[PDB]
């Protein structure tokens, strides 16, 4: 009945190809799902997990997905194993867990000296992220010492000059400036499930629309889809345009005009009027704000919409 909880296991293959922040898309992801008694044991689940996915218990390790105060979600460490599952999840239901597995047993992890770090390589030429797996590293390890593993996993020649960032959270990608300090010195509040994003330091990057990973994540963070509806066409479903929240009036107008194969001066836009259907007040072309300022009367979930008419 309500004595049961759902436990959701995510595997590393789901981290592959992810273009967003964190390890995967919380809104779109494959899980192996388990119905488990809230008062069942960890050791029970582990055996039941072992039997089910064809892996001996020595070759698997559970890293519960943990929500952070800043809104991100990351694998966290989990000796303990006789507490109930609902206590370990701290009353989260469902509870999502990253399942690390070996591949031709797992290396030991010292809860006090190591950290599990995830790696992403950014390619400015194609403007894409490439998941480079995870590593066990001693906290006392210098940043410089991590470079060969990064070069190795990205397919770069050894001693390739790299630029390194910490992906802290959406719109916060912090460049690591001194490669010769320990990891805990480089990364404030160093934790398991932290992410280092790195890229080749080549002059050819600056021809890219998005030359660094910081730029990439900034663009992604401000990206917004807006429905545009023709005021003079009743019950128009409208069309979707991908914009940026930091666009000014002119950039919106021009983008919508290229969508409609027309001139931006032949387009009159109207504000949202919110929950009411239909156009609100006219938008003037000397508007001094950003697209974000125009859509701030919308919640993050509420579908963004604007009205237009051809002149």
């Amino acid at each position: 009945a309500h004595l049961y909880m759902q436990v959701q296991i995510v595997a590393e293959d789901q981290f592959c190809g992810h273009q967003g922040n964190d390890m995967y898309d919380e809104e779109k992801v494959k899980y192996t799902v388990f119905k488990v008694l809230k008062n069942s044991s960890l050791a029970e689940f582990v055996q039941s997990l072992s039997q089910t996915m064809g892996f001996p218990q020595d070759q698997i390790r559970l890293w519960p997905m943990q929500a952070r105060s800043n809104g991100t979600k990351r694998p966290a460490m989990l000796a303990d194993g006789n507490k109930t599952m609902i206590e370990l999840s701290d009353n989260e239901n469902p509870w999502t867990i990253f399942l690390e597995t070996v591949d031709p047993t797992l290396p030991k992890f010292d809860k006090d000296h190591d950290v599990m770090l995830f790696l992403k390589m950014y390619d400015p030429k194609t403007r894409s992220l490439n998941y480079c797996g995870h590593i066990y590293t001693p906290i006392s390890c210098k940043i410089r010492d991590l470079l060969p593993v990064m070069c190795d996993r990205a397919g770069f020649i050894q001693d390739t000059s790299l630029i390194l960032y910490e992906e802290v959270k959406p719109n916060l990608t912090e460049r690591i400036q001194d490669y010769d300090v320990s990891l805990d010195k480089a990364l404030d509040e160093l934790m398991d499930g932290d992410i280092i994003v790195f890229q080749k330091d080549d002059p050819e990057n600056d021809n890219s629309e998005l030359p660094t990973a910081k730029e990439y994540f900034r663009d992604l963070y401000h990206r917004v889809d807006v429905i545009f509806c023709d005021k003079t066409i009743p019950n128009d479903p409208g069309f979707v345009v991908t914009l940026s929240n930091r666009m000014n009036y002119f950039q919106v107008a021009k983008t919508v005009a290229q969508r409609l194969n027309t001139d931006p001066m032949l387009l009159q836009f109207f504000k949202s009027q919110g929950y009411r259907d239909g156009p609100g007040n006219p938008l003037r072309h000397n508007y001094e704000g950003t697209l974000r300022d125009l859509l701030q009367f919308f919640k993050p979930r509420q579908p963004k919409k604007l009205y237009y008419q051809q002149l």
């Binding site: 943990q66 952070r68 105060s69 991100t72 009353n91 802290v168």
Partner: peptide, 13 residues
């Protein structure tokens, strides 16, 4: 002077 933090600690329920 004191640290404001980056919110990487665990979210309250």
């Amino acid at each position: 002077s004191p640290r404001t933090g980056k919110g990487k600690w665990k979210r309250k329920s």
